[model samples]
Target: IIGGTESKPHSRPYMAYLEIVTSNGPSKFCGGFLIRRNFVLTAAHCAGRSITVTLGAHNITEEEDTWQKLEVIKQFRHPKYNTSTLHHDIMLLKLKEKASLTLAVGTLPFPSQFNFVPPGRMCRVAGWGRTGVLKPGSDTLQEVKLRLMDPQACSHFRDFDHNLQLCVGNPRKTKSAFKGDSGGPLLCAGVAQGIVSYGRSDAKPPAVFTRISHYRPWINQILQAN
Candidate 1:
């Protein structure tokens, strides 16, 4: 989340770190959420040849005994995923082993009663991404409160369109999602409403997320098939 303060170590028990192998080193390039014992929800764009999930941890750089690193046995990106248009940016990961639930490890509840998280609702977005454009990622998770913006209003921007995406961020200022924050969850009323997708480099424009409600059917189909 952009322009936010540090969160408590276990405040976000479902928070996950997505690591990717790069030419330089193994980097934590994206964030994700534990949706089930052996499932993680993230963005398709975060996919890499060697991607892994680190669960039950807060201080990623520190040696934490509570952390459980899991290998990704399978990945399921949306069939309609498009890099140029950024449509269907969501993806699911099947863990090689089940996650052990604890006070610091659990799953997030997905929205069940609504087709969409109503606009204007206050929500929390959390991630281990950088606080700004030039800053390095935080060692611990960070969270920020944001108001969900109307799709119609957000469509005013050139990059935003339709209900496939959720819009959030400060409408009047620079507070917004930053680099490395992609694939994180946008939680509303304790339920995951969206998945972090894309944002501006200036960190001034509103952030766009893959609307979870719009892809519920696809998500369930994958879970059932696997």
Candidate 2:
């Protein structure tokens, strides 16, 4: 993120770093978070033929003792996820093994809400996304506080669906999430209210996040069956 600060090491324990592998394509990466012992939530567009998730991480380049690398036993991309328009862009990753909870590793619960997050609530988003143009993803997790923008502010984006998406960014500030931050949680009042979905390539203010509350039923079904 642009001008974000490095988060306290392992402070966001549920944070996940996803590695995508494809047979004929170059590797890719995205941010995600642990929602349960064996389940991780992220954006569906980050999916690939194979995925490896790293938990309890701060500096991703080093093989720290805190890191728990796990293979994805199953991937549950939202049934209606659309790549062209980035609609319904959420996914659940079932880890081959449960994550071992520790001070540096844990899960975040989504507390239900009756309505959308009110506009102007100051929220936070953390990730390893690029900090600038031509830069690779950050080695350390970075966080930026953003104001929940009014839905009307992003209406001109056209495809932005207010029913299943949240518009966030501080029109008054330069900080915002960027490439590689997709699938990360947009934490608001201790809840992961949204999933990083899409935004401008230049990493400007006003990005679209998948509204988690709208997909609660589908998530519950997936979590209950396994």
Candidate 3:
């Protein structure tokens, strides 16, 4: 969250922290959110066969009884995801055990329909990612309001599918999602509207996110199958 404010302790209960062993072996991290008791939503690229997840996290650098770390038993990546282009970038992680529902750990509602959220509507993105373009990642969760923009606002970027992606963040604002924030929820109202996909390395807006409404049918298939 570049130029964002620190989130109140566990204020965003649905927020989750994810860890995976991609290159350096457990050195990689990403953000995710709870959608069901044992289902976590993130980007397809961030999903791994075996992943680690922490729920109800705030200051992840410190131990807290409010949080629970768990093992992921299954990772469901989008079959149509394009690695080079980052298309259909959403994924789901199934937990080995169900998470207890509490104030500090819970779920976010999924969009009921494909209604356009409208450009200029206020939405939020939160994570433990870098706070600045060149800054290191944060220990505590941070959140920032990103104004939704016209789909064309991100047309200047590469591989942005109008139906499959959302254009977020204000071009004039410093508040935006960065590297570590990838896979985090683009929370619009109480719904997980999108998943952070790609952005400039400098961490500026307008960034792109995988549109949730477009994947609802596919997502439901998985939930029912499991």
Candidate 4:
């Protein structure tokens, strides 16, 4: 909801706010869905540190946040994910407890049927990122709408690498997944299309996501095993 409007922005109802409780203290963060029963898709960077999951939580400070804490029973990081370049910027965390898939926190179906989410689709991305360049702090966990960019437009940028990255939004900074909104989801046609990975590493034409559909085999294998 941009411009202070609270619209239903997240395409995936299971969007979760993950908090990493480190040895020093706790750090607030966010991420997206994986399975209904026992898994959550998140970033490898986040998993590198200590963390906990908070489901169905609207406010972090509320005593009855209606959330659950799941221990990381297992974690799988993409072999190609490079911290330096952020190429295959993806990771998955297996929750010790299973989550019930329901309409309230419904599971966003994975686009396992395709290689890409087809260009020019109306995609949605969201997060608790800073509202603008000046606001150095994070905003409330919120979702927003963004249009997918055509393959041709995305190709214009040398680093987009459409095979490994799915591009969206206006290149002119009109809309995007900004800073601090990493490891989230990019929704296409109400399915989990991508994960918020790396952006332009700048303010202009922000970029954030790791293509979620690309790793269907890995995603399915983990969920089924549980």
Query: Which segments of candidate 4 are over 4 A away from where they belong?
Result: 1-4, 7-12, 21-28, 63-65, 100-103, 113-115, 136-139, 151-159, 206-208
The C-alpha stretches of model 3 lying farther than 4 A from their native spots are: 23-26
Q: What lDDT is obtained when candidate 3 is compared to the true structure?
A: 0.88
| lDDT, model 3, position 130 | 89
TM-score of 4: 0.82
From the highest lDDT down, the ranking of the candidates is 2, 3, 1, 4
Clashes of each: 0, 0, 0, 6
Candidate models: Cα lDDT each:
0.83, 0.89, 0.88, 0.64
Candidate 2 collision pairs: none
Q: lDDT per residue, candidate 1, 133-218, as tens digits? A: 88888888888888887776567556576568888875886666677889999888888998889876777657888888878878
Per-residue lDDT value at 203 in model 2: 70
Q: Write the per-residue lDDT of candidate 4 for residues 93-211, one digit (tens) a residue.
A: 77777765545455556667375776667777666665666565343456667767665666545556766677767676456676556677877776778887755554455364677
- Model 3 lDDT per residue over 32-115, tens place: 989999999999979664689999989998878888888999999999988888898999999999999999999998775575
Error of model 1, residue 180, in angstroms: 0.9
Candidate 2 runs further than 4 Å off: 113-115
lDDT-best of 1 and 2 = 2
**lDDT accuracy of residue 145 in candidate 2:** 91
Q: Deviation in angstroms for 72 in model 3?
A: 0.5
**Index of the highest-lDDT prediction:** 2
